[PDB]
Ligand binder design. Sequence first.
Ligand SMILES: *[C@@H]1O[C@H](CO)[C@@H](O[C@@H]2O[C@H](CO)[C@@H](O[C@@H]3O[C@H](CO[C@H]4O[C@H](CO[C@H]5O[C@H](CO)[C@@H](O)[C@H](O)[C@@H]5O[C@H]5O[C@H](CO)[C@@H](O)[C@H](O)[C@@H]5O)[C@@H](O)[C@H](O[C@H]5O[C@H](CO)[C@@H](O)[C@H](O)[C@@H]5O[C@H]5O[C@H](CO)[C@@H](O)[C@H](O)[C@@H]5O)[C@@H]4O)[C@@H](O)[C@H](O[C@H]4O[C@H](CO)[C@@H](O)[C@H](O)[C@@H]4O[C@H]4O[C@H](CO)[C@@H](O)[C@H](O)[C@@H]4O[C@H]4O[C@H](CO)[C@@H](O)[C@H](O)[C@@H]4O)[C@@H]3O)[C@H](O)[C@H]2NC(C)=O)[C@H](O)[C@H]1NC(C)=O
Ligand SMILES: *[C@@H]1O[C@H](CO)[C@@H](O[C@@H]2O[C@H](CO)[C@@H](O[C@@H]3O[C@H](CO[C@H]4O[C@H](CO[C@H]5O[C@H](CO)[C@@H](O)[C@H](O)[C@@H]5O[C@H]5O[C@H](CO)[C@@H](O)[C@H](O)[C@@H]5O)[C@@H](O)[C@H](O[C@H]5O[C@H](CO)[C@@H](O)[C@H](O)[C@@H]5O)[C@@H]4O)[C@@H](O)[C@H](O[C@H]4O[C@H](CO)[C@@H](O)[C@H](O)[C@@H]4O[C@H]4O[C@H](CO)[C@@H](O)[C@H](O)[C@@H]4O)[C@@H]3O)[C@H](O)[C@H]2NC(C)=O)[C@H](O)[C@H]1NC(C)=O
Ligand SMILES: *[C@@H]1O[C@H](CO)[C@@H](O[C@@H]2O[C@H](CO)[C@@H](O[C@@H]3O[C@H](CO[C@H]4O[C@H](CO[C@H]5O[C@H](CO)[C@@H](O)[C@H](O)[C@@H]5O[C@H]5O[C@H](CO)[C@@H](O)[C@H](O)[C@@H]5O)[C@@H](O)[C@H](O[C@H]5O[C@H](CO)[C@@H](O)[C@H](O)[C@@H]5O)[C@@H]4O)[C@@H](O)[C@H](O[C@H]4O[C@H](CO)[C@@H](O)[C@H](O)[C@@H]4O[C@H]4O[C@H](CO)[C@@H](O)[C@H](O)[C@@H]4O)[C@@H]3O)[C@H](O)[C@H]2NC(C)=O)[C@H](O)[C@H]1NC(C)=O
Ligand SMILES: *[C@@H]1O[C@H](CO)[C@@H](O)[C@H](O)[C@H]1NC(C)=O
Ligand SMILES: *[C@@H]1O[C@H](CO)[C@@H](O)[C@H](O)[C@H]1NC(C)=O
Lengths: 840, 840
Amino acid sequence: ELAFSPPFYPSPWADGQGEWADAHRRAVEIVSQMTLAEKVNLTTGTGWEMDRCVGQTGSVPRLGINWGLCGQDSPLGIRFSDLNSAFPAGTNVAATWDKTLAYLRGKAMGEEFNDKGVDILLGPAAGPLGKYPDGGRIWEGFSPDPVLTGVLFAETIKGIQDAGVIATAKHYILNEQEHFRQVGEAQGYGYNITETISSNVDDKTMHELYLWPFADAVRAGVGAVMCSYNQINNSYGCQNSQTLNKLLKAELGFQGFVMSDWSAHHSGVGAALAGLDMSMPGDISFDDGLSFWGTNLTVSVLNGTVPAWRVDDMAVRIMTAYYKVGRDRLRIPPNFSSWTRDEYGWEHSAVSEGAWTKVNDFVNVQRSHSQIIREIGAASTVLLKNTGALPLTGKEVKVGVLGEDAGSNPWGANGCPDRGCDNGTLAMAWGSGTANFPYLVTPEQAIQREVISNGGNVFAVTDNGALSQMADVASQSSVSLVFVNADSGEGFISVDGNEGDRKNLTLWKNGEAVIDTVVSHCNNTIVVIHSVGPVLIDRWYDNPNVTAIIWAGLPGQESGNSLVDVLYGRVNPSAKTPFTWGKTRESYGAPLLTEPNNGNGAPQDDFNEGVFIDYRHFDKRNETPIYEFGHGLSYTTFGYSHLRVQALNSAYVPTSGETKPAPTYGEIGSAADYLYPEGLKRITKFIYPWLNSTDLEDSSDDPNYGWEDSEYIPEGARDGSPQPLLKAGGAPGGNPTLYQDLVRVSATITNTGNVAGYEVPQLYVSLGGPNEPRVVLRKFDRIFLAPGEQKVWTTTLNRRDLANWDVEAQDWVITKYPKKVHVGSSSRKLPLRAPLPRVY
Amino acid sequence: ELAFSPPFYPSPWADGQGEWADAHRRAVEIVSQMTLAEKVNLTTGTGWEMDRCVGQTGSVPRLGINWGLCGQDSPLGIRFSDLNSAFPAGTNVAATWDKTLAYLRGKAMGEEFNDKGVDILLGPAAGPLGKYPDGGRIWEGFSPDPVLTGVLFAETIKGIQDAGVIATAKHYILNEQEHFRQVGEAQGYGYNITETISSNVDDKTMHELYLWPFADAVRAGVGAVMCSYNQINNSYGCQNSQTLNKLLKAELGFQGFVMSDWSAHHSGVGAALAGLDMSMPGDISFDDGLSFWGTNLTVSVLNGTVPAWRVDDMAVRIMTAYYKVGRDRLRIPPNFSSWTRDEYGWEHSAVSEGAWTKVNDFVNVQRSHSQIIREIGAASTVLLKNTGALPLTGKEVKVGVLGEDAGSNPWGANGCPDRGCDNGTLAMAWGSGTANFPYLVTPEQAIQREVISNGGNVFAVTDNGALSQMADVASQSSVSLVFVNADSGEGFISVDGNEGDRKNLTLWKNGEAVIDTVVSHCNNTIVVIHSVGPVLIDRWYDNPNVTAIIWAGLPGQESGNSLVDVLYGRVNPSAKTPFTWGKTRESYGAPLLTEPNNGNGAPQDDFNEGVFIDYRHFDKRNETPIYEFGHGLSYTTFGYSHLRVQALNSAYVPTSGETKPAPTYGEIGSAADYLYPEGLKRITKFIYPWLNSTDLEDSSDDPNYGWEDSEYIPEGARDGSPQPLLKAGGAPGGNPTLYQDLVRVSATITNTGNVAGYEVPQLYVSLGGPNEPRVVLRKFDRIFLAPGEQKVWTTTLNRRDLANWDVEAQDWVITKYPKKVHVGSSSRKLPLRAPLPRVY
Ligand SMILES: *[C@@H]1O[C@H](CO)[C@@H](O[C@@H]2O[C@H](CO)[C@@H](O[C@@H]3O[C@H](CO[C@H]4O[C@H](CO[C@H]5O[C@H](CO)[C@@H](O)[C@H](O)[C@@H]5O[C@H]5O[C@H](CO)[C@@H](O)[C@H](O)[C@@H]5O)[C@@H](O)[C@H](O[C@H]5O[C@H](CO)[C@@H](O)[C@H](O)[C@@H]5O[C@H]5O[C@H](CO)[C@@H](O)[C@H](O)[C@@H]5O)[C@@H]4O)[C@@H](O)[C@H](O[C@H]4O[C@H](CO)[C@@H](O)[C@H](O)[C@@H]4O[C@H]4O[C@H](CO)[C@@H](O)[C@H](O)[C@@H]4O[C@H]4O[C@H](CO)[C@@H](O)[C@H](O)[C@@H]4O)[C@@H]3O)[C@H](O)[C@H]2NC(C)=O)[C@H](O)[C@H]1NC(C)=O
Ligand SMILES: *[C@@H]1O[C@H](CO)[C@@H](O[C@@H]2O[C@H](CO)[C@@H](O[C@@H]3O[C@H](CO[C@H]4O[C@H](CO[C@H]5O[C@H](CO)[C@@H](O)[C@H](O)[C@@H]5O[C@H]5O[C@H](CO)[C@@H](O)[C@H](O)[C@@H]5O)[C@@H](O)[C@H](O[C@H]5O[C@H](CO)[C@@H](O)[C@H](O)[C@@H]5O)[C@@H]4O)[C@@H](O)[C@H](O[C@H]4O[C@H](CO)[C@@H](O)[C@H](O)[C@@H]4O[C@H]4O[C@H](CO)[C@@H](O)[C@H](O)[C@@H]4O)[C@@H]3O)[C@H](O)[C@H]2NC(C)=O)[C@H](O)[C@H]1NC(C)=O
Ligand SMILES: *[C@@H]1O[C@H](CO)[C@@H](O[C@@H]2O[C@H](CO)[C@@H](O[C@@H]3O[C@H](CO[C@H]4O[C@H](CO[C@H]5O[C@H](CO)[C@@H](O)[C@H](O)[C@@H]5O[C@H]5O[C@H](CO)[C@@H](O)[C@H](O)[C@@H]5O)[C@@H](O)[C@H](O[C@H]5O[C@H](CO)[C@@H](O)[C@H](O)[C@@H]5O)[C@@H]4O)[C@@H](O)[C@H](O[C@H]4O[C@H](CO)[C@@H](O)[C@H](O)[C@@H]4O[C@H]4O[C@H](CO)[C@@H](O)[C@H](O)[C@@H]4O)[C@@H]3O)[C@H](O)[C@H]2NC(C)=O)[C@H](O)[C@H]1NC(C)=O
Ligand SMILES: *[C@@H]1O[C@H](CO)[C@@H](O)[C@H](O)[C@H]1NC(C)=O
Ligand SMILES: *[C@@H]1O[C@H](CO)[C@@H](O)[C@H](O)[C@H]1NC(C)=O
């Protein structure tokens, strides 16, 4: 009955090909010098809260790796630190539709992480992709569209890695919701389950939707990939040989390392052989002093179960990432502590051991990164509706600012751990995807400053119970700006019954009544929404007193200043929604899985919609959104003309051949080489690589130690002989003939209005055939045009852009169905269209 | 037995002498043309909420007074309006010790009032003077010191009147507290009394303390005086022949008009003959449709009781004020409504009658008045303590801003009627002494802006219950700034049991615990107090972690900007405390009278301390204040040297002679002249001058109509013959030989530190003799000095400055006790001293 994940073995070994040759060579050179305990140190974290960073490996001080590799959250700024910046969330980056802004944000973040002593940034994210509009972590990623996500994910990775820090593509893969993601956490919420949720997805959907942005990340040169907490067809993400060995390593050709999510590692031998490379934070569960790896990995290799080539490959993949971004020349010891903001603390925080020492140096790493934050906030402010309220001119006599979302968090910008509250303006959602603010500029502050400077009077009512006081201010104002929000986050935090995932898609903090009060008293009401994702606005959006509506996402520390830049027209808004605004929750497709449906076994989440999420689903059901994917307004207008299409073919080459045999590097030795050194003071619960004695069974102490391999290990898992190459593989990101250009497309874009600004033209294709979506996004850019100016936008469609995943062939194939190309300003406003020429 | 107020009659008639000659002449010219109903219209308001302004008289359209004279609150900005400024409170002005700033604030206010169409500003105030540190309205005035108060009151009056608006010196006199000020209000608070509080004071104390600033106001040319709600020796303020006829009109030579406080008028004939000139808002009680004057005043003159010379004198005094400031050329109709902010409303708001019409024209009158407000706020920020925390340099790495008093009122700046709350930053206290803000710059906003511009990180915790959150921010900060407050107001509003008057002298909104939390976690804590008056700080002020303490008063709309100007040293603080900071409540003298002590008659408030209030009391009891009257710190130091004293080459001439007989102007006519015009639609409850019929008794309808004069009118009250001149009278402000200069005094002031700034030198005298305070303030200035610079400060002491009120002689006499002069930086730091030469 249950979804099954078939075996793919062995775990592919790194090949040092292409742009990875130099870093792999330097990795082989150092790993060839390492003993087994040194290798194991790289693969295994030293335990929860045992060092400075949220994750930290063992060290190799004999060879100059003098402190462990340090991994730190988050995808929008350094977590658990100080004197750092708080960037706009991923969903805002997607709303900019701007490759360059995604790159620069990545670079700015990389600089901060580097300057704090961090080796590995735990991000950015393209999983969750965005199947569920109420999924708790959708905002951390980019968009439910895989092409928008993959492009901006890849640019963000390149910025981070150009700054000298290893990026970690996460969460791989199908962790679309928070409910049932972890057994202990589910049990704490009162649910009786004994395994995590299983995401069950067909092979075509996997390739065409969820995997696609990870292909982009690999091709962009991402150093690490983080495996997820959920299962995929009932095999855990950190030991799923299909996703890790076959799709990521054999097909996408990934040459870096796979790192577990925190306590997502569920077996020693099983995970190592199924493609895991690094166990974080290193213990079985936080501070239990046990490890699936560490000592157990040393023993698994000494007893012959995990071949030497596999542990050698782990250490090579890790060191390859290290050398690829230059950690050997850039790394400095972490100069802050995740676990306290005090100057002094215990060296090993979890157990109060080691030296009482200076754990925070107070190093300011902000530089002028406030400028890119302000910029991105303004370029991610989506103007959804504008019947002439905007821009503001500075001649407004009285301005009202209404709603708690305009005001300060009265507990301070950092006053709730992991931002686990919805107090004041919503500039950052909750969980591990967070950073501490250096400050937070509110809409109230920025609007008040600006109104005053223009001679206006201005009043801010920020108590969402004070409805009569709001009504009076609204009645007296020339324009009323009303602020509302909706929040969500990671599932280890629940705010008002939202257990990560949101329990509805409507407004928080009495926002529905706030809107009603203001709109019924002011015929020039502008609604500004800060939110993690879509909100159901059908009830009020079309009221004629609502003269403009803005979605500004989660803008980070410069929130108010970004917003006023757009309100007053210093920046002409250009952002487009990176998701659909539907009429009802049901319009989006299936609800979250929030009740166990497989007894007390793993809840089963069948991805029955296949590729049809967000706009694809609305298009297939012929549903009319309130605001479609790709919609946003400008203070000017843009016209589209002169579509031209030209074939370039001049062929796909399915990859054929064999790998090398699995190499080994560095002598393994025997148990007598790997005892705990005499005179080493063992730190309580710290995870080490060493053995209590030369008796391997006693040093491991596994209760099932020593079975025949075939009782618990799949066939081929230990086979280091040459393996066949997969047809759809061949280079990082897949077969390189996928990236050959087949068609060139041009369209002329004209600023047909009176104000300079950026437009986001979009190019969609129809691949044809029964059950293909009517249109799917393939190209976009953000282009600046003065009034009356024209530019010719030219792009190319490659083989992969026009292909479908053919499950019978196990390859990408351009089908025989007739295709079309469409260019315009959104997924529904597509005035240019033409047939594509036949290419294969 | 009970305090008694002896008769002084007749009510002195205006004489047109000196600077008043031109305006009195025009008043006579116009009043000589008026009929009796026209005269009565000037004297009598038209009823509560019957027109645009808080008070409005009848009109005289036949002679070009085409709408009634408009009186509007408040002493710190226009009340019940829009598009106006909100100025620092009177207590802030006193803290500046700066004559020019006081003048400029009055001028800025006058400009706003004039441009809204208002004739008469209901302010400024010198009553309450400040006998009670917990008195509810002490912040509206200046200082408990009569000289600091009189000088700044006079400069405020001059500014207002130089802008073309009549100033109203209030409240005259001895309304030192709010408890029992009004019968109906006291009964609403559960007290059983049938008359208002009687303030009972000896003659010398009256002259040397409470009356002294009113002398200053009269000499400065104030057009109106407002009489008080309380009794003086058991005769109501608005019919007290001693205070109105004798002290104000006969002795101080006042040539303007006396106006009642609102519903403070308590009889027709009695009050007219005792010296009242204008009844506001014109009804007996609000909207009862009855008047002690109006119809009743017409009848009182027609029946022979109130002589024609008295009603003629009322009209002449009112018109003298109107001409003195130029209302004939400057007046425009009021262009706002006090009773609604909507554009449209009923012409007569109280009864919804007259036309439905445009009552608000939305005229902006702010100009650049924000500049003088910011300036006065900075110049009123008293630096009480500084052990090196200030000024801030911009190098602070992390800045904490703690306390609700830093943050916004979440109901909006104008979210509580008459500011009757203590939400967010305290920039204005409550009651009639208020204005609506155009905006309000909080300390949070301004500090955050400034820190961010310097590269600091900044966090604001504004929930006074969030103590652990404040502790964590305080622990992490380089400097913590903690904001606390204490509020009070007029007695028609009670907040948390403070029935106008404050129920204690300690902090509001959990401030004592906020200070404890911050100071116990940060060794560089700056405390900023916003308050109506003194707060008891003995418990925490001397904690060595409190590195500075500021009292910033009630700074109006620019609060946060005024403050950051001083914090960062753009302004070098120069303010001095205008009251004493004592150790205990008892240190100040007698408690408020808060329980009835005379059965259910008038509570009796005996002013037994005489001239010994505030610093005079501390000095007489040899108590050590925490911070003495006149204390404030600078970022530099000032030295005092080279005292020189010289008797002037240059006697007092007691006034002797007689007045003119009382004049009459305009023919009175008879009852048939003063019927309601045929076809005039009478507005419900509006107050008119006219008679229902020629039967005077029926038109009046007084239940005790028609007694013989001697049964209810004191002897002399109807005597229009020539009267003796009082010895201590002779010109506005009293005998002009009081103001002859007798001694010149010089002292050299040096800036002995390294920062430019203003110093406030102070000159005190000891008048000598057993009954006399050790020192009393006589002269002060604010003088700017560059580092190392010296200036010679020269001033003159006049006859009044060295005199005592001699009760036997009923005159000012320089006594034969030896006197001394003292110069220095506070009432206690007086390094220069010398005997004064004998002068008389
Ligand atoms: C014209 O026309 C006109 C118009 O119309 C008119 O007029 C009118 O007139 C009438 C008569 O006729 C009147 O009436 C009256 O009045 C009175 C007054 O009153 C007021 O005042 C008071 C006070 O007084 C005082 O002061 C003043 C000033 O300020 C003066 O003026 C006076 O004279 C006096 O003097 C005194 O003192 C002083 C000090 O203080 C000094 O300085 C001097 O020298 C002297 O000594 C007051 O009190 C009052 O008050 C009240 O009222 C009010 C209002 O409402 C209120 O608010 C308050 O609070 C109060 O109240 C209370 O009281 C009340 C009753 O009265 C009740 O109801 C309540 O509840 C409460 O409790 C006023 O302000 C009067 O007095 C009178 O009466 C009387 O009598 C009756 C009857 O019998 C009674 O009932 C009452 O009670 C009273 O009694 C008293 O007196 C008597 C005698 O006279 C006696 O016997 C008794 O015992 C008693 O005694 C006591 O007290 C007193 C005081 O009061 C004292 O002095 C003693 O010693 C004791 O202790 C009557 O009412 C009217 O007003 C008029 N009106 C108008 C509109 O103006 C005419 O008439 C015509 N003519 C022809 C020819 O036709
Ligand atoms: C989707 O998911 C969302 C996220 O999980 C979820 O969000 C939640 O939404 C609900 C609403 O749907 C929110 O709850 C509402 O919050 C309102 C605002 O609460 C705050 O303000 C209150 C009012 O304060 C005024 O009144 C006080 C009492 O007089 C004064 O003390 C105040 O000074 C203030 O004054 C103003 O009003 C005075 C007149 O009352 C006036 O004189 C004065 O001048 C001035 O104008 C506070 O009381 C409240 O604080 C109390 O309650 C909270 C908990 O709710 C405590 O933490 C506090 O300690 C304190 O006890 C807040 O500060 C509420 O007004 C609203 O109440 C109404 O509904 C509740 C039950 O639902 C009733 O008990 C109550 O009587 C109210 O009924 C009225 O309205 C309802 C419509 O809602 C109507 O049916 C009814 O007939 C009646 O008219 C309610 O609690 C909640 O905060 C959101 N949570 C989060 C985390 O965001 C959302 O629900 C989900 N969507 C759906 C559809 O499921
Ligand atoms: C002189 O004249 C002055 C002017 O009139 C006069 O002023 C008044 O002073 C008093 C005393 O200082 C003031 O009243 C105090 O106000 C404090 C703050 O109130 C606000 O915050 C409260 C706490 O909020 C936190 O806790 C809540 C409950 O857990 C949470 O829901 C919140 O989210 C918040 O969280 C923080 O703390 C949590 C731990 O608790 C923590 O988990 C979290 O992370 C975070 O850190 C709120 O409860 C309160 O709101 C409630 O109550 C008010 C009424 O007070 C209602 O209007 C609200 O609707 C709501 O129901 C406010 O928002 C209070 O902490 C303090 O409480 C203490 O005293 C009362 C009795 O007086 C006890 O019932 C209470 O248990 C507390 O006891 C503790 O402290 C006292 C010390 O006072 C101690 O003796 C005792 O042993 C114990 O330790 C108190 O109410 C008042 O506001 C002032 N009024 C004005 C107008 O300014 C002054 O008193 C006069 N002077 C004298 C000496 O007479
Ligand atoms: C709003 O209403 C007013 C009066 O009802 C009208 O004059 C104005 O044109 C309206 N403005 C908008 C935004 O339509
Ligand atoms: C406060 O404490 C710090 C401890 O780091 C100390 O270095 C500093 O000199 C102290 N400053 C004051 C204001 O005394």
